[PDB]
């Protein structure tokens, strides 16, 4: 209703331009031909410009009509690429709203479209790390429930990789604990990158895990090494302990020593043992040798025959060779004990002969009234008295020999009464 | 009215063409607005091409009819300067035709001017090379500036009237150059003027003909005929002078057709002839009157010798010896006529004179034969007779001369002496020796 005034309006000027061209014309005066050329001239170029108007707005209609196809299309084809409803039915399809309807629509279906795909590659991503530290592994327009499953499994890689992390950091804990335990120092590569580097930056596959499973079996297969063998030393120095004296402060000063799987505590388990065993060593030297002291003792009181029995000779001396002694010194006492009054009268019997020879040597000497000890009838008179006691003695322990004779079978000696008497003898040709 | 229905039909197609852009609208779409902006311009630019056209149509007749009255001022102007009538027509009552005739008239009459001018011009370049000639002003009112056709036609008047002229003088000139040419021809005088020069060596079309010029050609054509009547009269004179020696003397008809044939006009040396030839017959008569007197004078002499012995009484003729006026000859016949009609009246007197001395020897001869110491010639008888004769002849005559001696002495004249005083001393003297020889033989003897 204005355009049309508008028109309406043109249309009245271009009138009146008429009208004053032809009044023009008149006045000057042109003799209608040439009038009838300048107006066809006229019309001519006002045809001209209203033909380009024209033929410029079909044109713009032509522009809108393609645009529509071209948009029906591609927007008929991004609803398929995608699942969604194509938008419609407004019920005006003015040419110009409804080309900006298909062609924002279309728009947005490329936006999503990017924004889907992008997100395919970023979670493409995502899923190349997570199976590049796990170790356990076209791609072009995709859907809504293949990001959603997709996404799923993501978060569970995400998860079994935190159950990984977690796992492997108690395990490398545990691993340091025994290692240090052990007083040893990460040497092998894998157990360098377990427990030195560390920093997650260890992988996390299958294969790893295993590992690492089977080198903390090996640890604490060395630590349960190192308890049995320590154990068993302590009992070893318990074995020790029972068989001692052991007062209670040297126990409770050991008492340190009963601890661990420590290779301190391991040696000096060993030291306790080897010293202890080489002390009680000692004592049974010690208390054989002194055996063999009161062995010396009774062998005089009763020299091939004592050399017979012997076998102390060497370093061997233990509980065996102790009883050994200890059964032969008490033998040797049990006979003793019982020939006593036979091996006293012996003794007496050489005391008496020693010092009858010397009261016999003092009578001698004619120097006795010049050089000599006081009292000559009490030397004299006491002679006479072991010259009494001299053959009794002889004689009481003459029925003596013959009974040991009768229960010792074989003969008995002494230094290689045959001596006896042949010292007699000597007494008796001396004073010839 | 078909202009009009064109137009109303431009008319329905624009509303067509606006009924088919909305026609477009409607089958797409559109707003209001964008198609009313367009419709706009769509006003605007039909509102700018028809007020284009427009403006330039305008201008147009503006333009036609500033002109109109600018050629209609400068055809008032050059209606003004020359004098024509602003011509026109009422039929044509439109603007166009009116222009275009007016600057039509306008290029027509700058033409008329511009001939004009040209033709003024050239009537100039004429006019200043004829009175140059005519040694004369010869100029009009004549504005250079400002033409009129009464005036061109009595400039053109004017000018051929000096062409007339112009011939006319120069006719004059050469026939008076002609007649001059001829006399001096004649007369025989080089130019010794640069004038003269001016007008035969300096030859055609150099002669100024004013009419000073003209009157000094005419002034050397009376110098010419002064001098030749100058000559003419001379030899006017000569002519006299030769027919009157001829009627002085002899003049034969032959001779004088000699002369005549030698005889021309007064042209040339014939001056320095006939003068000749005057002195010439002056000297022929010179010669005649001499030749005759001294034929006279030997006649003189002789009539003398035949009488007058005296050299005294010769002398007292006095002039004899003068040398040849008429004077002198009548002289000469006057005193020749006494003489001759004086001695003729005593012819005989002096013949009986001459014949006394003429037997005075005769007879000496024959007495000095007589003496004769020789004793010679035949015939002595005869000598003898003719001796006595002669004896006897003398007396006879002696006393015949005595008398007419006395008889003339005594009233013709006073006295008389031949050959010296006492004429007849001579006689006696002559008798005197004669008588001593007389004496001197009879002494001998």
Redesign the interface.
């Known amino acids: 209703r ?3 005034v ?2 309406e ?3 009245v ?3 009146k ?2 009208n ?3 009044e ?2 008149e ?4 003799p ?1 031909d040439q ?2 050329q300048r ?2 001239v ?2 001519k ?3 001209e ?3 380009m ?2 033929a410029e ?2 044109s713009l ?1 032509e522009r ?1 009509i393609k645009s529509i196809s071209v948009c029906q299309k591609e927007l008929n084809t991004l609803c398929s690429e995608l699942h969604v409803e194509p938008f419609q039915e407004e019920g ?7 080309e900006k309807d298909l062609r924002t629509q279309v728009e947005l279906m490329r936006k999503q479209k990017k924004e889907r795909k992008q997100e395919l590659k970023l979670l493409q991503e995502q899923d190349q790390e997570l199976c590049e530290i796990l170790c356990m592994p076209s791609a072009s327009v995709p859907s809504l429930e293949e990001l959603n499953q997709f996404r799923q499994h993501v978060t569970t890689l995400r998860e079994t990789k935190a159950s990984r992390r977690e796992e492997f950091v108690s395990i490398k804990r545990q691993i340091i604990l025994c290692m240090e335990e052990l007083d040893h120092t990460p040497d092998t590569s894998f157990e360098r990158d377990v427990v030195c580097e560390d920093e997650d930056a260890f992988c996390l596959s299958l294969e790893n895990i295993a590992t690492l499973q089977k080198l903390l079996r090996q640890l604490e297969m060395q630590k349960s090494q190192n308890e049995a063998v320590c154990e068993g030393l302590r009992t070893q120095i318990r074995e020790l302990w029972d068989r001692l004296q052991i007062p209670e402060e040297e126990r409770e000063a050991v008492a340190t020593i009963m601890s661990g799987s420590k290779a301190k505590v391991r040696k000096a388990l060993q030291l306790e043992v080897d010293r202890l065993e080489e002390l009680k060593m000692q004592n049974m030297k010690k208390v054989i040798e002194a055996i063999r002291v009161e062995l010396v003792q009774y062998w005089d009181q009763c020299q091939e025959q004592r050399q017979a029995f012997a076998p102390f000779c060497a370093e061997d001396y233990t509980e065996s060779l102790l009883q050994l002694h200890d059964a032969e010194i008490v033998r040797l006492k049990n006979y003793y004990e019982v020939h006593k009054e036979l091996f006293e009268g012996v003794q007496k019997w050489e005391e008496t002969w020693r010092l009858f020879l010397e009261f016999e040597r003092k009578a001698s000497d004619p120097n006795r009234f010049t050089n000599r000890g006081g009292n000559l009838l009490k030397e004299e008179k006491q002679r006479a008295k072991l010259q009494k006691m001299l053959p009794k003695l002889e004689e009481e322990l003459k029925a003596r020999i013959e009974l040991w004779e009768q229960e010792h079978s074989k003969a008995f000696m002494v230094n290689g009464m045959e001596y006896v008497a042949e010292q007699w003898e000597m007494h008796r040709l001396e004073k010839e």
């Open positions: 204005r355009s049309e508008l028109a309006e043109s249309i000027c271009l009138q331009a008429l004053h061209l032809r023009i014309w006045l000057i005066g042109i209608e009038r009838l107006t066809e006229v019309k170029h006002i045809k410009l209203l033909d108007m024209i707005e079909e209609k809108l005006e399809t003015t040419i110009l709203q409804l």
